[PDB]
Each structure stands twice: as C-alpha cells, then as structure tokens.
Design a binder for this molecule. Structure first.
Ligand SMILES: [Mg+2]
Ligand SMILES: [Mg+2]
Ligand SMILES: [Mg+2]
Ligand SMILES: [Mg+2]
Ligand SMILES: [Mg+2]
Ligand SMILES: [Mg+2]
Ligand SMILES: [Mg+2]
Ligand SMILES: [Mg+2]
Ligand SMILES: [Mg+2]
Ligand SMILES: [Mg+2]
Ligand SMILES: [Zn+2]
Lengths: 178, 57, 116, 83
RNA sequence: CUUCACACAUGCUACAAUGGCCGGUACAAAGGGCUGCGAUGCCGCGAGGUUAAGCGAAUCCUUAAAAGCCGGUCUCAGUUCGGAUCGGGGUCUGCAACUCGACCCCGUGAAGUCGGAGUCGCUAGUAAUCGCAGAUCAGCAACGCUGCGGUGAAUACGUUCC
C-alpha cells in the first residue's frame, strides 16, 4: 500500500479542506498523473535512443515509456518527419504515488546543489513542471552502464484549479519550495 | 500490455545512514539500496570589506 | 561513491582522489588524512561507507566544496568589475591583472596569436 | 604599509585635511597628488580627485573601497584598440 | 621609461616512468662578510621575526651541496608530468610596492604528448647535465653577466661535395 497515498488520504485532504472552504468533499485538489519525457536531440544523428531513453526510463519509473515521433520537419534542427525525437511515459495510481514518494524522499535532495524547487513554475491552472539536465541520481540507474548523459523533465497534474491550491498541495505532499 | 514489456516492479526497502528507512516497490534491483543522505538529513530541509579591514588593521 | 564530486577515479590512491575535489589538493588532503587517521596509501575501491560518512562531515566543517567556492570567486571578480579599479578594468578587458608584461605575452588571458 | 606591524599607510598631510572636515561634513571635490595613500575607513561619503599624471580623477568610496588605493581607480595609461 | 590587435631574436619550463612524491643518506671548488656574516634558542607548515655569542676573518658565519644510494607508492594517463593564469591569506626592504619589487601558505590547475620547410652549438674532462659564489642594489639577478666544482660519453674512414 502506497504510504504517501495513505498519508494523503489521512491528513492532506483535511488540510486542504481547512485551507480552502470547499462546499463538497470532492472539490479537494488531488494529483492526477505524473509525466516524464526525454525530448532527445539525437533524432537526426545516430538515431539510437531506444537504449538511450527507454532502457533507463523503464527502470527509473516502473513502466516502459511510449515513443514519440516527430510531428513535423525542421531543416534548422535537421528535423525530418517520422523519426522519434522524444520518449514520454506517464505514471498514475499507486505507481505514481510510489514514484513521487521515492522522488521527494531520496532523489530531489540528492542532485547537485539542491537549493529547492522554484514555486513559480506553475502553468497557471494547478499543475507544476520542472526538469533536470542529466542522468538523474536515481539509484535505479548507475553510471557504470549508461551512454552519453541526458536529462529529463516531470509534469505533475493535479485536480486543483488554481496555482495557489496546486502549490499548497505540493507543499503538503512534501515538495521543497523557496 | 504487461506481459514481458514492463520492467520488474517488486517490493524493496530503502536504508539510509540517517536512519530514515521506508519500504516501497522499485525496479529490477530486488535487494537493498545503500544511501547516505535522505529527506530528513539533507540541507534545505532542516536549514564585509570594512570588517575585513578592521580585522586586518 | 560521491560526496560532492565523483571523488573516485578508478584504481587511485584516495590521497590523490581528494585532490579531485574543488577545495582540496595535495597539502589539504595530507592535513585532512593526518587529522582523520586513515593512511594515504590505499586504493579507493577498498574505502567503505563508514569512512566516507566520517569524511563527509569533516570537509564541510571547515573547508569548502564545489559550487559555493566558485560562487564566491565569481562574486569577487564581479564586484571587482563593477567597482572600476585598475584590476577591474583589466578583468573587463581580459588582460592579466598582476602587473605582467603585455607586449609579447598574456596568451593565456587572451587567445592564441591572432595573426590579423 | 602591507605589514601587520605599523598599520596602514596614510599621509599626514592628507589626514590633517580629511579629519578636519569629516567632523562636520563631507567636503566637496578635493585636490590630492599622492596616489600612494591607503583609504582608511574615514573616507566614506567623501570624494577625491586623484591625480593620474595629467589630470585628477574624482573617486567616491561607498562601502567597499577600503582595502584599495586612491590611484587604483585612476587609469595611468590609456589604450583604445589599435584596430 | 614596465602599454598591446601583432612579428622577430636570446634564455627557462615542460610535454614524463633515464620519471614524480615520502623517509633516510655521502662527497666540492671558488668567493662574500661592522650600514655586515646573525652560531645556537624560541615563534610560526612555511618565507620570515625575536634576544644573543664568535667573526676585519685557514680559527666565526656562509655551510645543507645537488646530481649519486637505499625502501615504499604511482603504472603511460593531459597523469602523483606540466606550473601559466586566477581568488583568498602572510613575510621582507623601501616614507610610500594598483601602475611599481621579491618571497611564503591554501585552493583553482591552461597550452603542451618531442615541434613544418628550415635552422644553432659541440672533438675531452669537450659536448650533456646538476648545483655554488661575486658585481650592480635598501628591496628587484636559483630565466641576464662573470667565474667555480661534481658525474660524464659516441664519432673523425676521408677532404669530392655547401
Ligand atoms: Mg625597456
Ligand atoms: Mg634569459
Ligand atoms: Mg609536481
Ligand atoms: Mg628528498
Ligand atoms: Mg619553527
Ligand atoms: Mg604518454
Ligand atoms: Mg591538449
Ligand atoms: Mg599541471
Ligand atoms: Mg622536425
Ligand atoms: Mg646582489
Ligand atoms: Zn538520511
């Protein structure tokens, strides 16, 4: 049983209810999904991301990601239509709960010069986004068998309708902000 | 489709030098993971020229 | 293993591996080892997490590491730039500041021979 | 004079001009010709038109130019990019 | 008089394992010294500072020679090679060291992996290599100059050819 989900259902829901006077119990914000994508640049060159992106995202997250191919063609990026440029996975349910717990517990503090996630990177609707720049510190992946380094980004989507509610939900969940 | 595609996701346990230990389900590593810093011990979670001239002279 | 940097070059004496951190070199590593007690001549693969965790607190107790040292350096040079002294003007022009000759040298501060 | 045995180096004919004014006010532009005098923490709020060979460069210390020198801020030579 | 988009000339440094570091360790010459040589002792990792004896000198200082030898480490790597640049902190002389001095401590640690066509010096205690001293001078010369000493080679058949 996801301990972060249990802690949420135990106290975070009540905390959000106290913070915002919702008229009904299901007006309370709740995280819907967590999405992690690559968007690699080695699409027109050497075309080798199935081992560069999928093989690490699968062990980082818990499910194999979906491959995204180019939606257009750009000469400046040497981008053609039809070849993969990015790999995206989405985490939901108890898998998302465990991934968020593991992140906030051991991964976020463990990167270089962790000074806290900026609380101003919200999209304006109640969902947050931030991303790293290298092979993350996830203990699931070790440097000894990785190719050229590549970073990743996370989109966390919540039931909240406002940025303040989203920030409060993340703070209660355990996101270290400024 | 979860037949052979997804990597293994089996119960694990995190052991930290601080002492903060919790158990979840992780990827292919089925054993333990040894860490030295956790959320309970990392920073950010627990928190003059004139003066230099004065101490110099 | 990692304290701040990689700190673990393969098959290297940790005496010299400590020099790979930003803030400790030969003498700093020697004085740290003298204080701690662990011998210099030992391969880094034999070092253990207990020794790492007693070493981790010592460096942050008095010395400094990657990131903040370079932040202090860049703050110092930036303040020197904005205050507008002779050294600050030399830094703004990229020319060496410590009175070295500029007629036939300073190729490190500038680029190689331009040959205009 | 860069030694922890005599304090800093400040000219007496400069002290007898700055200490007689800083009691009541920060004086206006002042004339000085000794670039070699150290800035004691008494020049805050004042100005010094320091000589550099041909003219006087007015220099104001706000908070930080205490370990510096008066002539440090007066370009003794002028270079303007042969090309 | 010391600038700086550039080029030349003369020297040093390296690009390493004939090596780097740690500890121990033996052998010189010639010079300098009352505006000085500072024997010891103390403080400081350190350069340096302090009180102080002997020394117009074969009796005092300089004075420890380094190359040489032993044991461990490193294992051909932009490296335990390389020390240019930069930040911080001290010492010495000088009234005054940003311009505009030298040295000491920490950290950061660039090019460089033997150098194109071409070009320089060298036949014996020579080239090669490592240290020492003087003169100028308050400080600036262990990258210049002049002398000193240690270890220490290979080639010359021949004068046609520059
Ligand atoms: Mg000249
Ligand atoms: Mg020379
Ligand atoms: Mg070395
Ligand atoms: Mg030795
Ligand atoms: Mg001592
Ligand atoms: Mg090599
Ligand atoms: Mg190179
Ligand atoms: Mg080097
Ligand atoms: Mg050649
Ligand atoms: Mg002399
Ligand atoms: Zn911990």
């Amino acid at each position: 049983q996801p301990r972060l989900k249990e802690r949420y259902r135990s106290e975070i829901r009540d905390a959000l209810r106290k913070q915002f006077g919702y008229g009904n119990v299901m007006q309370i914000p709740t995280v819907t999904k967590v999405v992690v994508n690559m968007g690699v640049g080695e699409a027109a060159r050497d075309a080798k991301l199935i081992n560069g992106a999928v093989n690490d995202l699968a062990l980082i997250t818990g499910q194999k990601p979906e491959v995204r191919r180019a939606r257009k063609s750009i000469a400046q990026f040497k981008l053609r239509e039809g070849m993969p440029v990015g790999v995206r996975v989405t985490l939901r349910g108890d898998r998302m709960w465990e991934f968020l717990d593991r992140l906030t517990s051991i991964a976020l503090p463990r990167i270089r010069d962790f000074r806290g996630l900026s609380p101003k990177q919200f999209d304006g609707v109640g969902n947050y986004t931030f991303g790293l720049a290298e092979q993350a510190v996830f203990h699931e992946v070790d440097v000894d068998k990785i190719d050229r380094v590549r970073g990743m980004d996370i989109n966390v989507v919540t039931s909240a309708a406002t940025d303040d509610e989203g920030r409060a939900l993340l703070r209660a969940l355990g996101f270290p902000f400024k | 489709m979860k037949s052979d595609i997804h990597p293994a996701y089996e119960e694990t346990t995190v052991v930290c030098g601080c002492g903060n230990t919790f158990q979840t389900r992780s990827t292919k590593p089925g054993g333990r993971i040894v860490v030295e810093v956790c959320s309970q011990c990392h920073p950010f979670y627990t928190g003059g020229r004139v003066a230099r001239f004065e101490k110099r002279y | 293993a990692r304290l701040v940097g990689v700190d673990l070059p393969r098959d290297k004496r940790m005496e010299v591996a400590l020099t790979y951190i930003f803030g400790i070199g030969r003498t700093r590593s020697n004085e740290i080892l003298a204080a701690t007690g662990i011998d210099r001549d030992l391969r880094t693969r034999d070092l253990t997490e207990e020794q790492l965790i007693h070493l981790r607190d010592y460096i942050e107790a008095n010395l400094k590491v990657e990131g903040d040292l370079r932040r202090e350096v860049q703050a110092d040079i930036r303040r020197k730039i904005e205050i507008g002294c002779y050294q600050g003007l030399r830094h703004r022009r990229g020319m060496p500041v410590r009175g070295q000759r500029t007629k036939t040298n300073a190729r490190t501060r500038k680029g190689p021979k331009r040959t205009i | 004079p860069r030694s922890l045995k005599k304090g800093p180096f400040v000219d007496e004919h400069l002290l007898k001009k700055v200490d007689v004014q800083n009691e009541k006010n920060t004086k206006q532009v002042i004339k000085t010709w000794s670039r070699r005098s150290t800035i004691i923490p008494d020049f805050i709020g004042h100005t010094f038109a320091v000589h550099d060979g041909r003219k006087h460069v007015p220099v104001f210390v706000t908070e930080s130019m205490v370990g510096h020198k008066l002539g440090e801020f007066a370009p003794t030579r002028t270079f303007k990019g042969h090309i």
